[PDB]
Design an enzyme around this catalytic site. Structure first.
Site, PDB file in Angstrom:
ATOM      1  N   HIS A 267       1.361   5.475  -2.061  1.00  0.00           N
ATOM      2  CA  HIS A 267       1.034   6.472  -3.075  1.00  0.00           C
ATOM      3  C   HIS A 267       2.201   7.406  -3.334  1.00  0.00           C
ATOM      4  O   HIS A 267       3.070   7.613  -2.486  1.00  0.00           O
ATOM      5  CB  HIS A 267      -0.184   7.299  -2.674  1.00  0.00           C
ATOM      6  CG  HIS A 267      -1.332   6.451  -2.260  1.00  0.00           C
ATOM      7  ND1 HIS A 267      -1.964   5.597  -3.132  1.00  0.00           N
ATOM      8  CD2 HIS A 267      -1.918   6.266  -1.056  1.00  0.00           C
ATOM      9  CE1 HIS A 267      -2.912   4.944  -2.492  1.00  0.00           C
ATOM     10  NE2 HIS A 267      -2.906   5.330  -1.230  1.00  0.00           N
TER      11      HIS A 267
ATOM     12  N   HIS B  50       0.831  -1.206   0.000  1.00  0.00           N
ATOM     13  CA  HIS B  50       0.000   0.000   0.000  1.00  0.00           C
ATOM     14  C   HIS B  50       0.866   1.256   0.000  1.00  0.00           C
ATOM     15  O   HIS B  50       1.477   1.583   1.023  1.00  0.00           O
ATOM     16  CB  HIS B  50      -0.939  -0.004   1.213  1.00  0.00           C
ATOM     17  CG  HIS B  50      -2.045   1.015   1.152  1.00  0.00           C
ATOM     18  ND1 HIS B  50      -3.113   1.003   2.029  1.00  0.00           N
ATOM     19  CD2 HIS B  50      -2.242   2.080   0.338  1.00  0.00           C
ATOM     20  CE1 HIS B  50      -3.925   2.010   1.749  1.00  0.00           C
ATOM     21  NE2 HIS B  50      -3.414   2.684   0.733  1.00  0.00           N
TER      22      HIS B  50
ATOM     23  N   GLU C  94       1.551   2.540   4.021  1.00  0.00           N
ATOM     24  CA  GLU C  94       1.162   3.818   3.444  1.00  0.00           C
ATOM     25  C   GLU C  94       2.100   4.930   3.914  1.00  0.00           C
ATOM     26  O   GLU C  94       1.665   6.003   4.333  1.00  0.00           O
ATOM     27  CB  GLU C  94      -0.292   4.139   3.760  1.00  0.00           C
ATOM     28  CG  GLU C  94      -0.983   4.987   2.697  1.00  0.00           C
ATOM     29  CD  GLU C  94      -0.904   6.517   2.952  1.00  0.00           C
ATOM     30  OE1 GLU C  94      -1.449   6.982   3.994  1.00  0.00           O
ATOM     31  OE2 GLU C  94      -0.317   7.248   2.100  1.00  0.00           O
TER      32      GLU C  94
HETATM   33 ZN   LIG Z   1      -4.080   5.316   1.039  1.00  0.00          ZN
END
Ligand SMILES: [Zn+2]
Ligand SMILES: [Zn+2]
Lengths: 339, 339
Positions: A8, A6, A282
Site C-alpha cells: 500500500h 501485497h 506489505e
Molecule cells: Zn494490507
C-alpha cells in the site's frame, strides 16, 4: 523475478492526508469538501523514492503490486458521497506512481464501498481503474462497516453482480478490510487477521466457485489463522459434508507470505500447496521495525522464502509465477516486455 | 499425569437440549420457563461412558477439565432471565458428571453473561460453582452478543470486578465465545479463532496484568491465529511502543494444544515457551472425524505431543505441570490425593 503481491501507498504527500481530514470534517459539518490539492510529480517521486523504492532495492525485489493505503480506506463515516471521491483520489495517486515508476509498480484499486450502498459504484471504479488506468486487480472489503461483520458473507448474491465484472475483466481480488471503528478490535493486529479467517470459512460453508469457476481470491497475511489450523479446516469439510478443500477452494484461493517470522513461513510452505503461495511483504505497513531476535526486518519476508529449503521450481512460483497466473493482465504486460 | 484442559459436555440427555428449545420458545411470547426435566445417573453415565471416557481410555489420558457445551451456552436473545437459569442448569450437569466420575473430570463453569448486563450474576455463579460445587475455573465470554464484538475489551474497567473474584477464588478463565448470530461468521471455524486473536491483541494494547498480576487467561485453539503470526505480534509491540510480549503478557496468558495437525502442533511448540502450553484436545467437539492424511483422529492431540522431540520435563509441563500451576485448586485436590 520477484513480484511482491501485497503493498500500500502509506507514506504520502502531506496535502493528501490534509485534504482527507478536511473532506471528513466538511461532511460531518454539512458542507461540501474543499477542492483537492495539486500534487507535484516530484512530491510523489519523493515519498516513493524515500521508502518503497529504497527497500525494494535493498531487499532484492523487482516489482510490488501497489494499492491505496489500507487503514485510510476507512469506508465508515460516512456515505458514498465521501467514499467515491476518496476512492477515486487514492487510485489516481496509485495510477500516477505507476506513471512515474511503471517498471516497478503495478496498480490495484480500492473500492468506494460503504455500509449503505451496494456494489454499483465499486463496479464503476473497478472498470475505470482496469480499463482506463491500466490496473490489474482490486481490494475487496468484506466488512465495510468495519468491525462488526454486519455485511453479507462473500457467498451472498449481494456480491454476485460485482463478481461478474471481475470475471469478465479477468481481475482477482484480495479480500482486505480497512480501519476499525471498534475499540475492542485493533485493525492491523486483530481485525485484519479475523476477517481473513472468517472469509475463508465463509467460502468453506458454500460453493461460490460453482457459480464463478474462474473467480480468484487472495486472502492476505498468510491466510489469517487458516494454514496454522489447516487440519481443523480439513476436518470441518467433513463435518459440514462439504467437498475436500483442495478442490472446493484452492484452485480459486491463494495465500500471500506476509507472515512475519520464519516459523510462520516454514509452516505456510509446509501445509499449503506451492501454487497457492504468493510472495508478499506489505512493507512500510503494520510492522516497520527490526527484529531484535534476528537483526533483519520483520517485513523482509523474502528472507524467509530464501531461507526455505525448496527447489528452484518452487522458488520461481512463490516469487513470480503464481502471481502472474492469478493476475493475467500482469502476465500479459510482462510478455509484451519480453519477460 | 495426562490432563486435557479443554473439554465440553457435548452429547447431552435428550430433555436438556429439548428444554432449551422450549425456554427459547416460551420467551418467544411472554412466558416463564417450562418444567426442568429429571435426568438419571445411568443416562448421564452412559453418554460419558459411550463417549468421553471411552476415548480418554484409548487416547491414554487421566483427566479432562470439563465445561458446558460451548455452542449451546450462546445467550443471544435475550437477557438475564434466560442466561442465569440456563447456566445453572448447565453447570449442574458438569457437577453431576464429576460426582459420578471424580478422578477423571474436574469442573469449569460457563457464566450467565448477556449483552445488556454486567458481571454481577457471573460473579455469583462462579462463587456458587467454585465455593459450593468445587469448580476449578470458569469459561469467560468476551462477546455474548453472538457475533459482532460489540462488547468492551478485556482491558476495560467493565471487567475488573470479575477479575477480582477470579483472583480471590484462585480460579483462571478460558477466553471463550459461543455460538454465532452473525450470518457472515461460522462459529467453530471462524468465530472461535477470530475471538482468540482479537482477545490477545486487546491485552497487548494495554497493561491489565500490571493491575492483576495474578490474573491468568487461557486462550484456546493454540491461541487462535497468534503463534502463527508471533513475529507480527512481537513487531507490533514495538509499533505500539509497548513492553515485550514475555513481560507484558506471557506470565498470565496460556495456550492450549487444540491445533489439529502435526505441523500446527510443531509450530506452537516451536514459538511458545514451554511454560505457556497446556495440553488439550477438545475431543468430541467441533471436529469429530478421522484424518484421511494420517489415519488417526484430528482431535487426538496427544499423538502430536508424543511426536515432538522434547525433554521429559518439557513433556511433563504440557501434560500435567502447566495446568496444575494455572488451576491451583486442582493441584491442591491432586496433592490431597498424594499424586
Ligand atoms: Zn494490507
Ligand atoms: Zn472449546
Amino acid at each position: 523475478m520477484i513480484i511482491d503481491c501485497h503493498g500500500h501507498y502509506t507514506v504520502l504527500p502531506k496535502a493528501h492526508d490534509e485534504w482527507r481530514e478536511q473532506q471528513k470534517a466538511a461532511f460531518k459539518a454539512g458542507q461540501p469538501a474543499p477542492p483537492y490539492p495539486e500534487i507535484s510529480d516530484d512530491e510523489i517521486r519523493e515519498t516513493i523514492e524515500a521508502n518503497q523504492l529504497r527497500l525494494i532495492k535493498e531487499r532484492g525485489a523487482d516489482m510490488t503490486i501497489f494499492s491505496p493505503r489500507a487503514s485510510a480506506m476507512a469506508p465508515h463515516v460516512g456515505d458514498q458521497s465521501v467514499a467515491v471521491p476518496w476512492a477515486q483520489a487514492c487510485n489516481n495517486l496509485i495510477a500516477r506512481v505507476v506513471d512515474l515508476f511503471p517498471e516497478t509498480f503495478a496498480g490495484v484499486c480500492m473500492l468506494p464501498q460503504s455500509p449503505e450502498a451496494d456494489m454499483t459504484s465499486s463496479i464503476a471504479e473497478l472498470e475505470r481503474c482496469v480499463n482506463e488506468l491500466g490496473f490489474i486487480g482490486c481490494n475487496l472489503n468484506p466488512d465495510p462497516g468495519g468491525g462488526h461483520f454486519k455485511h453479507p458473507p462473500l457467498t451472498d448474491r449481494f456480491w454476485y453482480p460485482f463478481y461478474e465484472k471481475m470475471v469478465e475483466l479477468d481481475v482477482p481480488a484480495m479480500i482486505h478490510v480497512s480501519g476499525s471503528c471498534n475499540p475492542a478490535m485493533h485493525a492491523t493486529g486483530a481485525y485484519y487477521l479475523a476477517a481473513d479467517t472468517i472469509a475463508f470459512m465463509q467460502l468453506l460453508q458454500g460453493n461460490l466457485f460453482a457459480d464463478f469457476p474462474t473467480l480468484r481470491f487472495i486472502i492476505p497475511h498468510g491466510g489469517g489463522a487458516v494454514p496454522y489450523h489447516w487440519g481443523r479446516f480439513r476436518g470441518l469439510a467433513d463435518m459440514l459434508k462439504q467437498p475436500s478443500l483442495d478442490t472446493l477452494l484452492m484452485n480459486n484461493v491463494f495465500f500471500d507470505t506476509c507472515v512475519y517470522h520464519q516459523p510462520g513461513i516454514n509452516l505456510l510452505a509446509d501445509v499449503i500447496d506451492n501454487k497457492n503461495i504468493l510472495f508478499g511483504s506489505e512493507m512500510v505497513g503494520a510492522v516497520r521495525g527490526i527484529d531484535p531476535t534476528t537483526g533483519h526486518y520483520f517485513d523482509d519476508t523474502k528472507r524467509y522464502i530464501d531461507a526455505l529449503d525448496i527447489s528452484d521450481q518452487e522458488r520461481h512460483a512463490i516469487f513470480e509465477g503464481n502471481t502472474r497466473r492469478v493476475f493475467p493482465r500482469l502476465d500479459a504486460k510482462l510478455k509484451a516486455r519480453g519477460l
